[PDB]
Structure formats: C-alpha cells, structure tokens
Amino acid sequence: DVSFRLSGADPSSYGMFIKDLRNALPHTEKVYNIPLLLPSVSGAGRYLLMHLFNYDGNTITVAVDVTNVYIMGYLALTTSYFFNEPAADLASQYVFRSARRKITLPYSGNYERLQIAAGKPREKIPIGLPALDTAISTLLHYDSTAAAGALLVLIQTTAEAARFKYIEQQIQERAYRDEVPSSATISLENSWSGLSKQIQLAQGNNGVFRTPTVLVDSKGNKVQITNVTSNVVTSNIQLLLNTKNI
Ligand SMILES: *[C@@H]1O[C@H](CO)[C@@H](O[C@@H]2O[C@H](CO)[C@@H](O)[C@H](O)[C@H]2NC(C)=O)[C@H](O)[C@H]1NC(C)=O
Numbered sequence: 001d002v003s004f005r006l007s008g009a010d011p012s013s014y015g016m017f018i019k020d021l022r023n024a025l026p027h028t029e030k031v032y033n034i035p036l037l038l039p040s041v042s043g044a045g046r047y048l049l050m051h052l053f054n055y056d057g058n059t060i061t062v063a064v065d066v067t068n069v070y071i072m073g074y075l076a077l078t079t080s081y082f083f084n085e086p087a088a089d090l091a092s093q094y095v096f097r098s099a100r101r102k103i104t105l106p107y108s109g110n111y112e113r114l115q116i117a118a119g120k121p122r123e124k125i126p127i128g129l130p131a132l133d134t135a136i137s138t139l140l141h142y143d144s145t146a147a148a149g150a151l152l153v154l155i156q157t158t159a160e161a162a163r164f165k166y167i168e169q170q171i172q173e174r175a176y177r178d179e180v181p182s183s184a185t186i187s188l189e190n191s192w193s194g195l196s197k198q199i200q201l202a203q204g205n206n207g208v209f210r211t212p213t214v215l216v217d218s219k220g221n222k223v224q225i226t227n228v229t230s231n232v233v234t235s236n237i238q239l240l241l242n243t244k245n246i
C-alpha cells in the first residue's frame with residue numbers, strides 16, 4: 001500500500017506519492033487513454049491503505065475504496081474512526097480489525113455533510129502540504145468538529161489530486177504555504193462523476209459527449225465541455241468512475 005511523509009517533503013516527493021496512489025488502484029481497461037476504475041471488488045481487496053506521517057513523524061493510516069477513491073475511515077494509534085454511512089460500515093469489517101476501539105463519526109463522508117459539521121464551506125478552508133501536516137495532527141486526537149475540517153483537507157490533498165492533475169499542481173504550488181482552493185478546483189471536484197460518465201458515453205459516439213459538462217475555469221469563466229478533445233480529458237482527469245457506480 002502507499003506512503004507519504006510530510007517531513008522533508010517538497011513538490012517532487014508529493015508528485016511521487018500521488019503517482020504511487022494512482023498506480024495502486026486496479027483497472028483492467030482504459031477509456032480514451034484513461035484508467036477506468038473497476039465496477040466493484042470483493043473482500044479486503046477493495047481497500048487501499050495510505051500511511052501518512054506528519055512533520056514530527058506521527059502517523060494515521062487511511063482506508064481508501066479502490067473502486068471510487070473514497071476515504072472510508074482511518075486509524076489513529078489504536079482507535080479506528082469510520083464515517084457514518086453503509087459503505088464505511090461494510091469497510092469496517094476488513095480493515096483496522098486489530099483496533100482496540102472503533103468510533104463512528106457523526107456524519108457521512110460527502111463534502112456536503114462535512115461542510116455542515118465543520119461550520120465552513122471548503123471555499124474558505126486553506127489547503128496545501130502545511131494544511132495536510134496539521135490535518136494529520138488534528139486527527140490523532142478525536143474531535144468531530146475539528147476532524148470534519150481536517151478530512152476536507154485530507155480528501156482534497158489526496159483523492160482529489162489523484163483524480164485531477166490540475167489539483168495535484170494546485171497542491172504542489174501550495175507546498176510551503178496554504179491557500180484556499182480556486183473555483184476551478186472546486187467545480188472540478190464536483191464534476192468527477194458527470195465527466196466520468198460522459199467520457200464513457202462518448203466511446204460509442206465518436207468522442208462526443210451525450211450531454212455537455214459545464215465547469216468554472218482557471219479565471220472564473222463558465223465553460224462547456226462537449227467532446228473528449230478538451231484539455232480536461234486529454235491532460236487533466238486521470239481516473240474514471242465506472243458508470244456502474246453512477
Ligand atoms: C469539440 O469541442 C471543441 C471545444 O473544445 C470545439 O472547438 C471549436 O473550435 C475551437 C476550439 O478548437 C473553439 O474556439 C470553438 O468555439 C469551437 N468552434 C466553434 C465554431 O464553436 C469543436 O468544434 C468540437 N467539435 C468537435 C467535433 O470536435
């Protein structure tokens with residue numbers, strides 16, 4: 001499974017960790033040169049463990065669902081924390097079993113719930129490697145309100161960067177200074193599903209999207225994506241959510 005140490009980390013090692021993370025996900029085929037994630041997987045094989053070390057060397061192990069890259073829960077010393085949702089509960093049966101105590105967070109793992117519990121929308125939460133180091137720190141010692149904020153940072157600096165090279169770049173720019181995410185970043189995060197389905201719906205349709213995907217851009221200008229010729233498809237998105245899961 002994969003590892004990343006914030007100590008002595010620079011834009012380069014981060015890039016390498018994200019690359020390892022992408023390669024750690026199984027896929028059988030590619031769609032328009034892109035890894036298509038598996039429809040489903042059975043058993044403990046459905047989960048990837050990320051070992052993260054903050055600057056001082058403390059660690060938390062995070063469980064990721066390899067069919068969609070969703071964070072399911074994590075382990076901190078001897079306590080495991082899982083999201084309050086069906087998938088996370090199913091996941092609790094194959095990972096962190098040697099945990100002495102298991103705690104269910106008072107919310108499911110989607111941005112919407114996480115922003116409510118955290119009291120802030122993610123447009124106002126600064127991300128970057130320094131923020132990741134603090135997120136790790138905040139998760140070592142339970143606090144549901146603080147954990148909500150920490151998880152919004154953790155998802156973005158890992159799962160979202162895995163899915164979009166642009167977001168990986170946004171985090172490399174933020175390796176020594178945190179900064180709230182750009183509008184592009186957030187609409188990208190929100191479109192992973194839509195884009196994933198459309199790219200797949202295009203392979204029997206000459207690469208033309210059945211229905212266009214609207215995104216906010218680098219500057220803040222609304223922009224339509226209608227075919228697989230766009231940058232987003234040619235050199236941004238890196239993983240595709242199988243339509244089976246949409
Ligand atoms: C596919 O989508 C692209 C946009 O990514 C369309 O691009 C046309 O040409 C340039 C970009 O190459 C844009 O300035 C235009 O707005 C688009 N042309 C017009 C006249 O609107 C491209 O036409 C689309 N269609 C196909 C079959 O690729």
Ligand SMILES: Cn1cnc2nc(N)[nH]c(=O)c21
Binds near residue numbers: 069070110155159
């Ligand atoms: C990014 N994202 C959106 N919904 C999500 N739900 C869970 N459980 N984990 C995630 O990382 C996630």
